[PDB]
Amino acid sequence: GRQKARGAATRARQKQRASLETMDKAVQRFRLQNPDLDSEALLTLPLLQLVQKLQSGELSPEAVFFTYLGKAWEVNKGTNCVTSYLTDCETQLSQAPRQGLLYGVPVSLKECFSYKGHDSTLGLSLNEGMPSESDCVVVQVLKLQGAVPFVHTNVPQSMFSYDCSNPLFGQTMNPWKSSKSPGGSSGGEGALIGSGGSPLGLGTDIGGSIRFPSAFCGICGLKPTGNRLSKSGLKGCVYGQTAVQLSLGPMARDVESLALCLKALLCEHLFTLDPTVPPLPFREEVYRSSRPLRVGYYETDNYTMPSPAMRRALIETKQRLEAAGHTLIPFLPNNIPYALEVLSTGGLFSDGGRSFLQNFKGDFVDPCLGDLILILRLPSWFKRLLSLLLKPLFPRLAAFLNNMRPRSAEKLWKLQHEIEMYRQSVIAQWKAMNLDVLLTPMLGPALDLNTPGRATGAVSYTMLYNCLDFPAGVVPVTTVTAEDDAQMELYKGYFGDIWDIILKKAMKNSVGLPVAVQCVALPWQEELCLRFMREVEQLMTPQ
Amino acid sequence: RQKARGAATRARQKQRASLETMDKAVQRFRLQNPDLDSEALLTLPLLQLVQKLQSGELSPEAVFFTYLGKAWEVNKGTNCVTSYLTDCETQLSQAPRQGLLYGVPVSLKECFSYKGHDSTLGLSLNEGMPSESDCVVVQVLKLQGAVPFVHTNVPQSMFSYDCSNPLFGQTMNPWKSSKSPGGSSGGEGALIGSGGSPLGLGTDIGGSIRFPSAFCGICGLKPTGNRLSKSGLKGCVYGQTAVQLSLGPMARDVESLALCLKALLCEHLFTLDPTVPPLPFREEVYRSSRPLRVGYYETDNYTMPSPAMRRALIETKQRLEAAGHTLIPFLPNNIPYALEVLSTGGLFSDGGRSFLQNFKGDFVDPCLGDLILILRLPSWFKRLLSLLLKPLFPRLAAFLNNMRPRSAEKLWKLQHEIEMYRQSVIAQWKAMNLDVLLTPMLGPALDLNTPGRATGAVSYTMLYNCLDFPAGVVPVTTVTAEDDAQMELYKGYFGDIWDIILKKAMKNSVGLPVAVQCVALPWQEELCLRFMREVEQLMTP
């Protein structure tokens, strides 16, 4: 009794296949006409250079476009990141505003960015055969800014997992090792950009979903403050949940590409299409700024034990920043357990998961969601009871469960006030130390396919800054050595509960995979956060 | 009811002593300066006062104590001052010289935290619980050279557009003592409107900057809710975010509002409250004189306007036309739904239960009307009573049914609807390619104790709290005898008890001010101010 859903999957798949076929024919024809094109120089040019060469006219858009389109199709063979080819981009290609700061640049789009005439399924059956009526606001500016959006990239079912699988388009895989997860929910983007198949893309992040796949796939991402960019026309599962803001941001191969993307997005076209975004232009002076920083740091959040590879990544970065003349100050946000267990969990699931669970009636539940659906479906009394039984043995589990229960509007107000207060608390702690910026460990290396869904507590490094609504970004700094991988077999975890035990295992067999560091600033300080990410990049990956 | 009588007695002796201190102070100053022209000092516009302070032509002591004295006098008739911020003479000598508000005395609505003073809000439970530091906004006024000098009265719990409470009593309209000064920023309306402060700060969640400014014949702006910092404000409910609180300036002219905003939107604010987007005052947008595409309406088809409101609005329209702006009819869609389901649901999602906590044990002031008795009613009876009402009095039924406690699930739905509704109007706006929107503003002032029984009148202002657009108010005319006689033909659109109370309440108002409202898209407060300036210039030069 799941026939509408199997119907959905057959259509989704036949669509994907057709998309991928159109791409192939498009690129096959281009190559026939352009057999002397230096395809290697083109693909591996950094975005700034690619952009100037489009601007200068040294490269035509078609050159850069059809080259990339090709590489996209090829990496998809190994990764399954492309759900659909945005088929009207050859019209936008020739119509692409020449004065635009992204003139010529092919951009990949997470599947939840509305695009005229395409599904934003999110892997749910019920969003299939329901094409978006028009581009979303962000796509409209990208397009006005010269860019060429050309693919929708896979997401986990409902977007509420940091793996990347669904019953429609199936499962995306890490380009460095197909046994691993690309992370999620922006996994499609991570895998594509990560294997050279796109020079810039866009994802969303409400608990780490830009930073997770960026880190896992060896690329960069920024989650700006939630209302820096416009969420008009973005597809989601719940609407009207404002305790924890959704934030949307760029994913690229280097920091400078994130900066350009922000400057291009942060312009009059955006502010006029979405009046509700504050018209805060991109302060380049602050981005370009190069003075010594007061950098707070922690090696561990005392919640998720870092992997050896993570802590190496973090100490080595710290030590380089000191080398470079920045002041490194021990710092740890107060009451992280509260922040994750009561504030974030409570705001994400204030209604017990009822609104979210609706999306799943009649549909399959993808393996990479774990028991999330099972646990949300549990009645409130029983969630509470199970929570009390769990509490003495596994307190972390008890905490989360009990905060995933439905509440009254009265209790929501109280929660949202607490979130306001926690945010001020941390800002005060931050100013007490007079920090400029905050260096943090980032989850890594990639967990095995279908394991993120069972290691929820490892969302601690990223979700904190969704709760606080601070800008936060992720840059790659190192890769897992044999020594690191070995030390993992002694990994214990702070709680010793099912989530730590799975994580030990999910990070096994990781030698070679990219591991990241995290960069946070105060609200609306994206350009400082990005300035700081650039320093880390310059130091830790000089080339 | 002992605690409530005790708190009243305490409140009253605290207020009395402040006035004494004030008196003593001004009286010592005047002996030392018998030949200062206080008539000239007090009637200079803020911009010229400020320049004179900056040149040195005037001492900060001269302007401080001269305004302090006027405040004491005007308080005798209005009862607008609840407390003298007694430590402001230290601040006087400390005010940084480069500050854009150097030497300006500023009045504060009672709810802006001030180190060492209560923010009672008229509630007994808040009495004798002094604030322990200054709110961010008060800190930046000080870092900008201003001198906050008094807390001014509010209605009990701030949830009324009258201005009385069992603690400090009842504030009056300085134009006519039988009239309300409006509220909840009523104290500031009375004080500013009678010459006792050149600039004040108030807050607005459903009209509370705009009502008293209109009723008392001064200017005010309710910005986009998050343009300024609400870190440190005293309130009754916290973490209601569907309809945003907004704080903002009140003053005698539009330029005062503009300067004040230029003073607040600076690095001190953005550093003290990082949660506020650091948008500086775009001086070029405010100073611009390009012709404007002015959306307008004469009535929200919900609250029938007073003859004075109508004339005010049409006279303004006509002058803007004369000055070559394009005037385009425009009415946000679904106002009735916006007020009845979105705005009321947003403010009372929890049945008013959090609100009600604040009244446990206190008297309920008469100017709240029956808000409290209504909310104390159990949901099932609110729904039953709403059903009875619906056929003859839908507005009433509509509000009552929407003041019932809901789930978090239901609040998400309501929250999502507010978001969609905000975008639907932005879409209307852009379809007619408007810059700015001209609407009526409630007026003239209602009689004492009638606003709390005329909740329907909230429609003109609250629409834009719901939508979170910047809205400001400018006095444009005064009620004529022709205007006032005509109120005798006013009927209302619904004929319900709100329309009957309102009719009566707006009567006997010859000579009272009547405003017009200016609106702009979110984050467009400088354009909105540019529009307010133009309306001031044309209607009251």
Ligand SMILES: *C(=O)N1CCC(Cc2cnc3ccccc3c2)CC1
């Ligand atoms: C991206 O922004 N995501 C996807 C990953 C998800 C992680 C997560 C999964 N399950 C729970 C259950 C309860 C509380 C918090 C979380 C987080 C965060 C959003």
Ligand SMILES: *C(=O)N1CCC(Cc2cnc3ccccc3c2)CC1
């Ligand atoms: C200032 O922002 N205020 C003071 C006046 C108050 C008016 C008001 C009173 N009662 C109800 C009941 C239901 C819905 C709306 C209102 C508004 C608005 C806020």
Ligand SMILES: [Cl-]
């Ligand atoms: Cl905002």
